[PDB]
mmCIF file of C-alpha atoms (C1' of nucleotides) in Angstrom:
data_model
loop_
_atom_site.group_PDB
_atom_site.id
_atom_site.type_symbol
_atom_site.label_atom_id
_atom_site.label_comp_id
_atom_site.label_asym_id
_atom_site.label_seq_id
_atom_site.Cartn_x
_atom_site.Cartn_y
_atom_site.Cartn_z
ATOM 1 C CA UNK A 1 65.300 144.263 -12.953
ATOM 2 C CA UNK A 2 65.162 141.224 -15.247
ATOM 3 C CA UNK A 3 68.608 139.851 -16.019
ATOM 4 C CA UNK A 4 67.771 139.839 -19.739
ATOM 5 C CA UNK A 5 67.291 143.616 -19.542
ATOM 6 C CA UNK A 6 71.050 143.753 -18.869
ATOM 7 C CA UNK A 7 71.540 142.870 -22.578
ATOM 8 C CA UNK A 8 72.937 139.365 -22.112
ATOM 9 C CA UNK A 9 73.770 136.609 -24.593
ATOM 10 C CA UNK A 10 72.583 133.266 -25.998
ATOM 11 C CA UNK A 11 73.682 130.847 -23.278
ATOM 12 C CA UNK A 12 72.660 133.063 -20.358
ATOM 13 C CA UNK A 13 69.251 133.719 -21.926
ATOM 14 C CA UNK A 14 68.689 129.998 -22.499
ATOM 15 C CA UNK A 15 69.759 129.174 -18.941
ATOM 16 C CA UNK A 16 67.446 131.775 -17.411
ATOM 17 C CA UNK A 17 64.541 130.764 -19.665
ATOM 18 C CA UNK A 18 64.658 126.970 -19.313
ATOM 19 C CA UNK A 19 65.352 127.028 -15.569
ATOM 20 C CA UNK A 20 63.282 130.056 -14.566
ATOM 21 C CA UNK A 21 65.531 132.773 -13.132
ATOM 22 C CA UNK A 22 63.754 136.044 -13.861
ATOM 23 C CA UNK A 23 64.948 139.012 -11.773
ATOM 24 C CA UNK A 24 68.341 140.341 -10.718
ATOM 25 C CA UNK A 25 67.034 140.377 -7.149
ATOM 26 C CA UNK A 26 67.447 136.620 -6.859
ATOM 27 C CA UNK A 27 70.853 136.961 -8.535
ATOM 28 C CA UNK A 28 72.050 139.534 -5.994
ATOM 29 C CA UNK A 29 70.631 137.282 -3.264
ATOM 30 C CA UNK A 30 72.442 134.218 -4.656
ATOM 31 C CA UNK A 31 76.198 134.065 -4.175
ATOM 32 C CA UNK A 32 78.797 133.107 -6.769
ATOM 33 C CA UNK A 33 79.026 129.565 -5.399
ATOM 34 C CA UNK A 34 75.229 129.282 -5.445
ATOM 35 C CA UNK A 35 75.081 130.382 -9.096
ATOM 36 C CA UNK A 36 78.069 128.437 -10.473
ATOM 37 C CA UNK A 37 76.551 125.098 -9.397
ATOM 38 C CA UNK A 38 74.543 124.914 -12.639
ATOM 39 C CA UNK A 39 75.802 122.400 -15.183
ATOM 40 C CA UNK A 40 77.040 123.457 -18.644
ATOM 41 C CA UNK A 41 77.753 126.895 -17.166
ATOM 42 C CA UNK A 42 79.695 129.314 -19.348
ATOM 43 C CA UNK A 43 82.877 131.099 -18.339
ATOM 44 C CA UNK A 44 81.624 134.153 -20.238
ATOM 45 C CA UNK A 45 78.405 133.945 -18.217
ATOM 46 C CA UNK A 46 80.438 133.811 -14.998
ATOM 47 C CA UNK A 47 82.520 136.804 -16.090
ATOM 48 C CA UNK A 48 79.518 138.911 -17.099
ATOM 49 C CA UNK A 49 77.554 138.067 -13.947
ATOM 50 C CA UNK A 50 80.592 138.962 -11.825
ATOM 51 C "C1'" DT B 1 -16.906 194.911 95.705
ATOM 52 C "C1'" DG B 2 -14.955 191.014 95.343
ATOM 53 C "C1'" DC B 3 -16.387 186.342 93.453
ATOM 54 C "C1'" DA B 4 -17.568 182.484 91.352
ATOM 55 C "C1'" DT B 5 -18.856 181.453 86.737
ATOM 56 C "C1'" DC B 6 -18.355 180.938 82.770
ATOM 57 C "C1'" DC B 7 -15.856 182.553 78.575
ATOM 58 C "C1'" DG B 8 -12.788 182.465 75.315
ATOM 59 C "C1'" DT B 9 -7.751 182.113 74.118
ATOM 60 C "C1'" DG B 10 -3.935 178.560 73.005
ATOM 61 C "C1'" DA B 11 -1.318 173.633 72.854
ATOM 62 C "C1'" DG B 12 3.840 169.348 66.080
ATOM 63 C "C1'" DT B 13 4.971 165.761 62.157
ATOM 64 C "C1'" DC B 14 5.032 162.600 57.187
ATOM 65 C "C1'" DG B 15 -6.458 153.502 57.282
ATOM 66 C "C1'" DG B 16 -10.609 156.581 52.888
ATOM 67 C "C1'" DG B 17 -17.244 156.571 52.341
ATOM 68 C "C1'" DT B 18 -20.758 154.519 57.850
ATOM 69 C "C1'" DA B 19 -28.933 155.880 57.444
ATOM 70 C "C1'" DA B 20 -36.144 156.988 58.491
ATOM 71 C "C1'" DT B 21 -40.879 156.184 58.359
ATOM 72 C "C1'" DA B 22 -48.140 155.343 57.974
ATOM 73 C "C1'" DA B 23 -49.062 158.868 53.707
ATOM 74 C "C1'" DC B 24 -52.270 158.267 49.482
ATOM 75 C "C1'" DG B 25 -55.987 159.393 45.566
ATOM 76 C "C1'" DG B 26 -57.445 162.940 42.118
ATOM 77 C "C1'" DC B 27 -56.896 166.681 38.722
ATOM 78 C "C1'" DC B 28 -53.898 170.182 35.641
ATOM 79 C "C1'" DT B 29 -50.506 171.451 32.550
ATOM 80 C "C1'" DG B 30 -45.965 172.057 30.429
ATOM 81 C "C1'" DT B 31 -42.480 170.746 27.727
ATOM 82 C "C1'" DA B 32 -40.502 167.040 24.792
ATOM 83 C "C1'" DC B 33 -41.692 163.766 21.615
ATOM 84 C "C1'" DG B 34 -44.395 161.331 17.977
ATOM 85 C "C1'" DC B 35 -47.882 160.962 13.714
ATOM 86 C "C1'" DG B 36 -49.002 162.397 9.096
ATOM 87 C "C1'" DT B 37 -48.786 165.368 4.968
ATOM 88 C "C1'" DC B 38 -46.519 168.624 1.889
ATOM 89 C "C1'" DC B 39 -42.881 171.111 -0.691
ATOM 90 C "C1'" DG B 40 -38.157 173.279 -2.149
ATOM 91 C "C1'" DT B 41 -33.808 170.948 -3.113
ATOM 92 C "C1'" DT B 42 -30.742 168.182 -5.324
ATOM 93 C "C1'" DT B 43 -29.555 164.450 -7.852
ATOM 94 C "C1'" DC B 44 -29.416 161.932 -11.381
ATOM 95 C "C1'" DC B 45 -30.700 159.806 -17.162
ATOM 96 C "C1'" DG B 46 -30.350 162.062 -21.915
ATOM 97 C "C1'" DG B 47 -30.108 164.933 -26.018
ATOM 98 C "C1'" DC B 48 -28.075 167.777 -29.740
ATOM 99 C "C1'" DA B 49 -26.087 173.386 -30.938
ATOM 100 C "C1'" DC B 50 -22.157 172.334 -32.193
ATOM 101 C "C1'" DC B 51 -16.551 173.143 -29.550
ATOM 102 C "C1'" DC B 52 -14.051 170.712 -32.263
ATOM 103 C "C1'" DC B 53 -9.185 166.959 -30.805
ATOM 104 C "C1'" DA B 54 -6.803 164.169 -31.660
ATOM 105 C "C1'" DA B 55 -3.571 159.984 -32.400
ATOM 106 C "C1'" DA B 56 -3.685 157.996 -36.623
ATOM 107 C "C1'" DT B 57 -3.041 158.299 -42.074
ATOM 108 C "C1'" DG B 58 -0.979 159.998 -46.856
ATOM 109 C "C1'" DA B 59 3.427 162.077 -48.816
ATOM 110 C "C1'" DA B 60 8.614 163.835 -48.990
ATOM 111 C "C1'" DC B 61 13.290 163.768 -47.457
ATOM 112 C "C1'" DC B 62 17.736 164.120 -47.468
ATOM 113 C "C1'" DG B 63 21.627 163.858 -44.769
ATOM 114 C "C1'" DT B 64 23.428 160.485 -42.676
ATOM 115 C "C1'" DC B 65 24.501 156.178 -41.410
ATOM 116 C "C1'" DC B 66 24.882 151.881 -43.466
ATOM 117 C "C1'" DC B 67 26.963 149.155 -47.904
ATOM 118 C "C1'" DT B 68 31.137 148.578 -52.019
ATOM 119 C "C1'" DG B 69 36.305 149.871 -54.664
ATOM 120 C "C1'" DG B 70 40.799 149.775 -54.529
ATOM 121 C "C1'" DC B 71 45.135 151.666 -53.012
ATOM 122 C "C1'" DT B 72 48.292 151.564 -50.729
ATOM 123 C "C1'" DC B 73 53.370 151.310 -47.541
ATOM 124 C "C1'" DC B 74 54.700 148.312 -43.617
ATOM 125 C "C1'" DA B 75 55.617 145.162 -40.136
ATOM 126 C "C1'" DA B 76 54.832 140.145 -39.444
ATOM 127 C "C1'" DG B 77 56.141 135.976 -41.621
ATOM 128 C "C1'" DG B 78 59.440 133.236 -44.312
ATOM 129 C "C1'" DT B 79 65.009 132.578 -45.678
ATOM 130 C "C1'" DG B 80 70.328 131.989 -45.145
ATOM 131 C "C1'" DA B 81 74.335 131.273 -41.889
ATOM 132 C "C1'" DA B 82 77.433 130.258 -38.017
ATOM 133 C "C1'" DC B 83 78.250 129.706 -33.688
ATOM 134 C "C1'" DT B 84 78.607 129.090 -29.019
ATOM 135 C "C1'" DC B 85 77.199 126.592 -25.876
ATOM 136 C "C1'" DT B 86 74.879 121.794 -25.576
ATOM 137 C "C1'" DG B 87 75.261 117.543 -25.930
ATOM 138 C "C1'" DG B 88 76.570 112.747 -27.778
ATOM 139 C "C1'" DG B 89 80.020 109.881 -28.577
ATOM 140 C "C1'" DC B 90 84.913 108.643 -27.656
ATOM 141 C "C1'" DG B 91 89.463 107.650 -25.903
ATOM 142 C "C1'" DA B 92 92.842 107.381 -21.567
ATOM 143 C "C1'" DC B 93 94.092 105.870 -17.298
ATOM 144 C "C1'" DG B 94 94.018 103.772 -12.850
ATOM 145 C "C1'" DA B 95 93.740 101.144 -7.596
ATOM 146 C "C1'" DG B 96 90.601 98.995 -5.582
ATOM 147 C "C1'" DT B 97 89.474 94.649 -7.508
ATOM 148 C "C1'" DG B 98 90.120 89.063 -8.527
#
DNA sequence: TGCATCCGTGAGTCGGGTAATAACGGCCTGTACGCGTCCGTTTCCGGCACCCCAAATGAACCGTCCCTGGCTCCAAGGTGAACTCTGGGCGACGAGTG
């Protein structure tokens, strides 16, 4: 599924659109350390992804 | 009444073909073939009695497949805010630096 289909918010949508993360398959493949490396990452984004 | 004298029986299996003598006119005809002429056949040009036959020549024709009128009734486009990152700019502080 697309991550946006999970009814996410402004910062997460902008991060997935500018960078190019499209499906939750790559998110479930990527670990928490591999996803928190992004700069200007939001604590709310971390909480919702967790 | 033997006795020789034939006499007639029989005796296995999957390169070819090799020749004389005196014979010779003369006449008849029988069938197949050739010549010339003649005639039924058939084969092809032409005409109306008309048989008309026909695509081509005049309508509608009107329902339908094209235009115009305008009316809407809604979702795309334009209008705010604030806000939550997003980022720029800013100040603080130090231990390797001088």
